[PDB]
Amino acid sequence: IQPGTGYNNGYFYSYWNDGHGGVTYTNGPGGQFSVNWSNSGHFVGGKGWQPGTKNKVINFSGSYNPNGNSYLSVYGWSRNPLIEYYIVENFGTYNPSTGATKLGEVTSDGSVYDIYRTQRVNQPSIIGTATFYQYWSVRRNHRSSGSVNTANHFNAWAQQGLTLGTMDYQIVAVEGYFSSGSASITVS
Ligand SMILES: O[C@@H]1[C@@H](O)[C@H](O[C@@H]2CO[C@@H](O[C@@H]3CO[C@@H](O)[C@H](O)[C@H]3O)[C@H](O)[C@H]2O)OC[C@H]1O
């Protein structure tokens, strides 16, 4: 399937890419999706909710085997203000917080997370080309299955001045940046 959003087997999904090639996104039954990629471009895909909420407890399980630059995250957006956010549970060779401004720490679901804010300028977004902040929680202890109590992150962020607008979609996402890998993830 081509990039798009919609509902599949009861779950919202979003699949986006930069058009390069080298990535196959597949919707499985229930909350399952797979991503297989090799010599990809930049892409983000996964399943979840539209809209997300600020208290959702998100469960994910399966396999995540990146070869290079990739993230596995609870991923979503707010509007008014436009914010792209991540709770990064695992990643490949590149830490997305590299060179980023650290805004605190939070402990949640069995690990410490480091909190960051970054800036995107004239980049793709859920409202088209836009300039926006990104908020990050990066898990210290990598894992490919677990539960994320999102409120712990949103609250810690807010305490540190990283506040959100109205919630748009909220998914468990596999993101890749010009790399290879595989993932098979079930969301609930
Ligand atoms: O049809 C439009 C969609 O194409 C559009 O999709 C979003 C475009 O921006 C994506 O965000 C990037 C994902 O990768 C990150 O590293 C970057 O920081 C982001 O720029 C987002 O994932 C897509 O959902 O949404 C609007 C539609 O009109």
Swiss-Prot record:
Query: What is the induction note for this entry?
Result: Induced by D-xylose, dependent on the cellulase and xylanase regulator xyr1. Repressed by glucose through negative regulation by the crabon catabolite repressor cre1.
pH-activity profile: Optimum pH is 4.5-5.5. Stable from pH 3.0 to 8.5 at room temperature and from pH 4.0 to 7.5 at 40 degrees Celsius.
For this protein, what reaction is catalysed? Endohydrolysis of (1->4)-beta-D-xylosidic linkages in xylans
| Residues passing through the membrane, by range | none
Q: What keyword terms does UniProt attach to this protein?
A: Carbohydrate metabolism, Glycoprotein, Glycosidase, Hydrolase, Polysaccharide degradation, Pyrrolidone carboxylic acid, Secreted, Signal, Xylan degradation
Record-annotated GH11 domain positions: 1-187
Q: Show the active-site residues.
A: E84 (nucleophile), E175 (proton donor)
Which Gene Ontology cellular component terms are annotated? extracellular region
Location of the protein in the cell:
Secreted
Q: Which residues are glycosylated?
A: N36, N59
Q: Where is substrate bound in this sequence? A: Y71, Y75, Y86, R120, P124, Q134, Y169
Q: Name the Enzyme Commission number(s) assigned to this protein.
A: 3.2.1.8
Pathways per UniProt: Glycan degradation; xylan degradation
Q: Which GO terms describe its molecular function?
A: endo-1,4-beta-xylanase activity
- Name where it mostly resides: secreted
Give GO BP annotations, semicolon-separated: xylan catabolic process
Q: Please state which protein family the record places this protein in.
A: Belongs to the glycosyl hydrolase 11 (cellulase G) family.
Q: What does this protein do?
A: Glycoside hydrolase involved in the hydrolysis of xylan, a major plant cell wall hemicellulose made up of 1,4-beta-linked D-xylopyranose residues. Catalyzes the endohydrolysis of the main-chain 1,4-beta-glycosidic bonds connecting the xylose subunits yielding various xylooligosaccharides and xylose. The catalysis proceeds by a double-displacement reaction mechanism with a putative covalent glycosyl-enzyme intermediate, with retention of the anomeric configuration. Produces xylobiose and xylose as the main degradation products.
Name listed for the protein in its UniProt record: Endo-1,4-beta-xylanase 2
What organism is this sequence from?
A: Hypocrea jecorina (strain ATCC 56765 / BCRC 32924 / NRRL 11460 / Rut C-30)
